[PDB]
């Protein structure tokens, strides 16, 4: 279809060509055979973690310390363990619970925070983006091209060979977007919108979830103890506010895109008459 058609170059050993998200290009000339050049695909290689959010916490290890009035600030001992989230509170007190003076007693409730599902955010750049470039002769074979090592010489045997310098510009603003992964569906979040979500988040290979309260409800106090729960899945209310992003497939540690194109110098010189 989009199979363009060019001609070597005015008595020269080169050609300057360009490809789209799909287009291929035939290059003809007197002496040398014709060479169908296609840009098969482009993928992101080995994406690194930048920040994964939680969307289904597990709350365990409850434990609420207390104190009447005139007994100061109740302090939960677990308040010394990072895994625990603690919210000092206040509750009615009186004779009915071992206090000689009706009034607001201190209270400190602690609970461990654990994550059950992470929305892992990843990043890419020049040092990892591949570019499939099939080459035919009229017998063929494909290969990949990076902004790091753009050129590539393909041995064609009895046909000859071809250098193929390149300039792998794309469409996406690299270092401006991220690869979000909610459940199985993968998406393309916009820079800030990502690190602007109100949810518990690990960092770079970190084991430290921050902004945790977001997912657990500290329920109505109760002289004795205080019930604490974790909120249901966010997957739902995360898909809902995330459909405008670009739906993609994170098939096997790689990413298929579309917004790409190459300007390549085809050194047909090495090609056999």
């Amino acid at each position, epitope marked *: 279809s989009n199979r363009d058609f060019l001609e070597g170059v005015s008595g020269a050993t080169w050609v300057d060509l360009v490809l789209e998200g799909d287009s291929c290009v035939t290059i003809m000339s007197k002496d040398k055979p014709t060479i169908d050049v296609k840009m098969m695909n482009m993928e992101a290689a080995n994406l690194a973690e930048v920040r994964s959010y939680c969307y289904l916490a597990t709350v365990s290890d409850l434990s609420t310390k207390a104190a*009447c*009035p*005139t*007994m*100061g*600030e109740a302090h939960n001992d677990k308040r010394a363990d990072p895994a625990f989230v603690c919210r000092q509170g*206040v509750v009615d007190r009186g004779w009915g619970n*071992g*206090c*000689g*003076l009706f*009034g*607001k007693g*201190s209270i400190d409730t602690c609970a461990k925070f654990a994550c059950s599902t992470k929305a892992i955010g990843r990043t890419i750049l020049k040092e990892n983006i591949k570019y499939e470039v099939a080459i035919f002769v009229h017998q063929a074979g494909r290969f990949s091209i990076t902004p790091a090592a753009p050129s590539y010489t393909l041995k064609l045997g009895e046909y000859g060979e071809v250098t193929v310098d390149c300039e792998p510009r794309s469409g996406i603003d690299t270092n401006a977007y991220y690869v979000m992964t909610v459940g199985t569906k993968t998406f393309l979040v916009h820079r800030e919108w990502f690190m602007d979500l109100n949810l518990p988040w690990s960092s770079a290979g970190s084991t430290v979830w921050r902004n945790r309260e977001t997912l657990m409800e500290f329920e109505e106090p109760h002289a004795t103890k205080q019930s604490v729960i974790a909120l249901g899945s966010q997957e739902g209310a995360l898909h809902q506010a995330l459909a405008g992003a670009i739906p993609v497939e994170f098939s096997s540690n790689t990413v298929k895109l579309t917004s790409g194109h190459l300007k390549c110098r085809v050194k047909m010189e090495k090609l056999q008459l």
Partner: antibody
Amino acid sequence: EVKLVESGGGLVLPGGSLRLSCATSGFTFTDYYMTWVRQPPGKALEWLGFIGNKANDYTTEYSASVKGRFTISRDDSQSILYLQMSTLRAEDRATYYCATVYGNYPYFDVWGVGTTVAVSS
Amino acid sequence: QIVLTRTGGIMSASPGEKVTMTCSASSSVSYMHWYQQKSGTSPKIWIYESSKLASGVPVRFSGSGSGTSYSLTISSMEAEDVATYYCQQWSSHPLTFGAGTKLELKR
């Protein structure tokens, strides 16, 4: 440890006023209730009033002997206690103590030096 | 108001000797506290909720009491026990102290 140092004691005429201070340290002032107790030159020991903490709306309670005459205030920002005093007379002559309150069933644990209040012309 | 009339206004005790002061109350009561004041010093909490000994307090001291009758007892009198001892009531308002029991070492 704890520090309860009274201040603002002197001689005053039968009817005058005075504001007693209890500068504290070595603990979280706001957290605890607080009380004033006076000891007359006669050993007897009179509770005057206490004042709750922030979370208890600074609830206060006074003894029959101090209705109107005095009122207690808390400078939670600097761990300071005050006992504003007005229209003193013969009976108010004493040594005024400033103690914290504590325990499930309240008791005055850490008292202070005390401060001397004389009423005469 | 509930008045705490103390039994044993003043008393002497020979070292090693067991001592007992009484706190009589003009009305029922829940708990009773005891304070120790040594000449010059400001009071100190000593017995709280009838029988729980304050901290630092020697295990020699002890308190019993229920309703309107309460007492503290030194197991074996000793010089450092020389002081005045006051009882405080809590069950009612206002808060009340007793007159105090002066304790002297009979040396």
